[PDB]
Structures are given as structure tokens and as C-alpha cells.
């Protein structure tokens, strides 16, 4: 069984922990408890592969650097109610890059509480559209509650990681 | 600030602030979990190295523990600590009654409680019959791998490297491979009845079922030796739970004894460093030798206490 070391980063309050304990273990946490570092295991199936995911929960503010050399795959989360989480993104896109020396760099865009359509700041096409100029990055609209595009975050970072 | 990694048996971790350094509690660090009133009452912090588990109380330091590790291995066992580092662990309360268990309803405190339990079984450490065992190995097929498709598991699914996660590890070689089929019988069954739930939380409440009437469930597991009546030494296993106590040999985790509170009494020995063993009706004694001997009888009257 292949392990997969994966990472999920943004600012503070984008639904990191709420997405990565939906996938993990199928709840939806609602009380806001900040972050310091947490990590889950699961196994999935990818491809008619069995895997073993490792995934690192971090902190909305920060050791950054160590998470980006040993990390795989790095799933970058804003809230679409939130523009700033979502101006925070392109400083982690690029330190990712330069950790890395490369950017081939297995990479999701997330826009999280797509279930909180009213309280929309960030629209879609603005979200597609910076996933353009990332080299043609994924990007998935998500919601940790509806359980919308909750899992297809990790499966595609898995696909990433092995071609 | 200050920090600490509180493992559970999967080999996730949760890190903590500690706000009070190495003086922080066990009850502190529990309130820094995510864990609600509900889900904290039936799990506590343990520490724990390669070769020794300790379950430690609400008032006790756990990074103190982990600092005065090497002389708490040299006055409980007889093991080198240079190969044994502890780790914090969130750990089932080996108190925790079977009848208060049956009640949860939480989805979190199931999942915790069922790793916990999976990890027990694949160790070898839950000791039962065939066909329970290849109960439990079915549903944790529903539960890792997903509904059952004849295309993906009908044939050469179950190969070691699928089998290692699914059945205790003292029988994957000479036991598990002649089980497929029934494995993969009641994996179907499971997927195909739509009377039963296919929640999450549902499948692995359905596994703890299965491993509440397992003797050896929830215990405490202490480390100890025996002589057989001509003297040889034969490492054990000592189980202590809520049900009683109960013997495994070290080697191969089988079963060699397994006694029921108000149907076996115990005596700490003079020196600390054995009890002994009286069991009704069957009419015979073995003394345990380990320097635990003081942990365990302290724990069996407490469980033995908590029985009405
Ligand atoms: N409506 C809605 N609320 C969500 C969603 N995802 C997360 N939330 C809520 O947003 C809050 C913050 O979520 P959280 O997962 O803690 O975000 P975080 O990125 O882990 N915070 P930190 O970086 O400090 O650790 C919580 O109250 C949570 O319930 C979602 O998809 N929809
Ligand atoms: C003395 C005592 C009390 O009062 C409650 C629980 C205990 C648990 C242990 C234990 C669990 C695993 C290893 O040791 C020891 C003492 C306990
Ligand atoms: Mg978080």
C-alpha cells in the first residue's frame, strides 16, 4: 500500500479542519477550534489502488517550510465568503514552488462553504480564473457541510501524485 | 508557547497547547482536545512506549511521566529504555463500563472507540472463534473498502496484503487464508441487505458489538511470567478489564486463562514483585511474576469494586 503525504494550507477559518474531518471521518465539525498542527490517516481506493493518506491539518497561520519539503500533494483552501483568504493563496502557491525548486507540484485550488451561496465575496469564475494562471492548477468549489466536493479533493491530489 | 502530540492508534495525532509547560494535567490536555463533554468522559490519556501502557489520572503530568520514563521502566519492567521513547496517547478508560459503551450514540466517540478496537484485533490481543473472527474481518470490509462488487473481490482480492488488515495477525498464515470465502460470503451479505445501515458510524458500532462479548475487551494489558509445574518460564500477558482477568501467552496470544469477577481471587505478594491467583471450582493457583504485580491488583479491585 502506497502512502500519500498530503497538506492542507490557507488562512485561518477557511474550513481546513471541517473538510479534512468530513473526508476522514465523516463529520462535520461546527465550533471553531484553531488549528495547531493535527494529522489523519485513510485508506481509499484510487484508480483500483489502495492508498494510504496521510494527511497534515495546519495551522491558518504558521514550521511551514518543513511542510512543504516532505509534503506530496498540498490542497490550497479559501473561503469564498472571505476575500482575504482568498488574496493569502498566491503567496503559498509560490513559496510551494520555491520550496520545491519546481512546479510540478501536485496542487488543488478549494473554494470552500460553496454552501453559503448567499454569503458569496468570491465568485467562481474569479476562482477558475487563478487556477488558470497557476499552469492550469485543479480547482474544485467545496463544502464541508454538504458534503459537496469533499473527497474528490484528496482522490485528486493521489491522481497527481502518481503520474 | 508549549506543545504536545496526542497520538491515537492509528497513528493519527492531535497537538495540544499546554499551557502550564510540563505541569500541565491530564485534565487540562483534555480540555484542549475537540472533544465535547460527551466524548471526553469515555477516554482518557495514556502513555505508552514499545513494551509499556500506562493509563494515567486527570491530576497526573503526563510530560513529567515522559521525563521520568527511564526510572518508571526500571521500577515496572526489566526492559533497557534506550529503545523504548513513550508517546501521549488518547486511549478508551479501561474503567469505562460495558453497560455505559452500549449507550454511545456519538459518531466520534464510536470511531475512536473502533480504532482502538480494530487495533486490538489485528495485534492478536482479542482472542475468539472463527466465525466471529471472520465476522469482524467482513465488516471491516464494508467499513475501509466500500460496498461489495463481484468484479473487484469475487476473486484474488483477499491476497496477505488485504488480509493483514482485515484479521489478527497471529492467524493471517495458518489460519486466515482457508476463511476467504466466508470472509467474502458475509462481506456480500453485508452490502446487499439494505436492512442494515451503511452509516459510518452505524458499520463500526456493529463492529464494537461483535467485540464487547470478547473476553479480553477494553483490557489493560500488563507484562509478567509463569513457571509450569520441571520448572520452565513462560511469558504471559496479563489482562485486566471490567469482565476480569485473563492470561495470553506472549508468544502466540493465545488464550491460556480467563477468570470472571466473584469467580477468582487474587493476593499482592509479600515483595511487590508477583500475585497470586485463586480461581473457584476449577480448584487450582498460579502466581504471576512481574513487577506490575502492584498496578494490577490495585486495578482488579477497582473493577471488581465497580461491579454491583
Ligand atoms: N456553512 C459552512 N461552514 C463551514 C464550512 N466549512 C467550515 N465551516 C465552519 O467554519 C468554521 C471554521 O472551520 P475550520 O475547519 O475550523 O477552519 P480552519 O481552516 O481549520 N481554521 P484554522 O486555520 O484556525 O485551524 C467552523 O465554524 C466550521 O463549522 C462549510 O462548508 N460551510
Ligand atoms: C489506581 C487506578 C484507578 O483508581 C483507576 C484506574 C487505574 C488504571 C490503571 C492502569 C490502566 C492501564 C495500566 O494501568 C492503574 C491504576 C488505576
Ligand atoms: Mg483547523
Redesign the interface.
Given at each position: 500500500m502506497r502512502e500519500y503525504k498530503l497538506v492542507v494550507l490557507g488562512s485561518g477559518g477557511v474550513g481546513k479542519s471541517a473538510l479534512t474531518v468530513q473526508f476522514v471521518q465523516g463529520i462535520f465539525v461546527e465550533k471553531y477550534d484553531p488549528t495547531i498542527e493535527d494529522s489523519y490517516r485513510k485508506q481509499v481506493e484510487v484508480d483500483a489502488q489502495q492508498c494510504m493518506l496521510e494527511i497534515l491539518d495546519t495551522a491558518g497561520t504558521q514550521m511551514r517550510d518543513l511542510y512543504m519539503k516532505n509534503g506530496q500533494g498540498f490542497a490550497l483552501v479559501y473561503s469564498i465568503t472571505a476575500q482575504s483568504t482568498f488574496n493569502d493563496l498566491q503567496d503559498l502557491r509560490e513559496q510551494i514552488l520555491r520550496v520545491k525548486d519546481t512546479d510540478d507540484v501536485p496542487m488543488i485550488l478549494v473554494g470552500n462553504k460553496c454552501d453559503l451561496e448567499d454569503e458569496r465575496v468570491v465568485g467562481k469564475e474569479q476562482g477558475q480564473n487563478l487556477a488558470r494562471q497557476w499552469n492550469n492548477c485543479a480547482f474544485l468549489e467545496s463544502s464541508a457541510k454538504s458534503k459537496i466536493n469533499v473527497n474528490e479533493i484528496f482522490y485528486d491530489l493521489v491522481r497527481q501524485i502518481n503520474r | 508557547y508549549e506543545?504536545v502530540?496526542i497520538y491515537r492508534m492509528?497513528?493519527?495525532?492531535?497537538?495540544?497547547?499546554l499551557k502550564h509547560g510540563n505541569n500541565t494535567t491530564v485534565q487540562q490536555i483534555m480540555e484542549g482536545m475537540?472533544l465535547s463533554q460527551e466524548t471526553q468522559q469515555y477516554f482518557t490519556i495514556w502513555i505508552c512506549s514499545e513494551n509499556l501502557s500506562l493509563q494515567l489520572k486527570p491530576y497526573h503530568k503526563p510530560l513529567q511521566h515522559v521525563r521520568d520514563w527511564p526510572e518508571i521502566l526500571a521500577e515496572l519492567t526489566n526492559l533497557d529504555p534506550q529503545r523504548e521513547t513513550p508517546q501521549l496517547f488518547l486511549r478508551r478508560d479501561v474503567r469505562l463500563p460495558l453497560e455505559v459503551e452500549k449507550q454511545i450514540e456519538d459518531?466520534?466517540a464510536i470511531?475512536i472507540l473502533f480504532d482502538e478496537a480494530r487495533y486490538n484485533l489485528l495485534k492478536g490481543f482479542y482472542t475468539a472463534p472463527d466465525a466471529k473472527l471472520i465476522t469482524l474481518a467482513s465488516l471491516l470490509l464494508q467499513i475501509?473498502?466500500?460496498n461489495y462488487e463481484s468484479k473487484?473481490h469475487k476473486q484474488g482480492f483477499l491476497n496477505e496484503?488485504?488480509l493483514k488488515?482485515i484479521v489478527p495477525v497471529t492467524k493471517l498464515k495458518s489460519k486466515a487464508p482457508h476463511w476467504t470465502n466466508r470472509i467474502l460470503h458475509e462481506y456480500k451479505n453485508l452490502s446487499t441487505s439494505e436492512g442494515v445501515s451503511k452509516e459510518?458510524?452505524h458499520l463500526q458500532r456493529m463492529f464494537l458489538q461483535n467485540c464487547w462479548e470478547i473476553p479480553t475487551y477494553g483490557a489493560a494489558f500488563f507484562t509478567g511470567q509463569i513457571f509450569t509445574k520441571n520448572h520452565k518460564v513462560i511469558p504471559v500477558y496479563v489482562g485486566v478489564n471490567i469482565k476480569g482477568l485473563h492470561l495470553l501467552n506472549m508468544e502466540t496470544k493465545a488464550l491460556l486463562i480467563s477468570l470472571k469477577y466473584g469467580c477468582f481471587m487474587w493476593q499482592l505478594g509479600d515483595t511487590d514483585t508477583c500475585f497470586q491467583i485463586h480461581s473457584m471450582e476449577n480448584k487450582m493457583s498460579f502466581i504471576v511474576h512481574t513487577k506490575q504485580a502492584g498496578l494490577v491488583v490495585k486495578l482488579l479491585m477497582k473493577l471488581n469494586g465497580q461491579l454491583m
Open positions: - | 506543545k502530540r492509528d497513528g493519527s495525532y492531535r497537538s495540544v497547547e475537540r459518531p466520534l470511531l475501509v473498502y466500500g473487484k496484503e488485504n488488515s459510518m458510524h
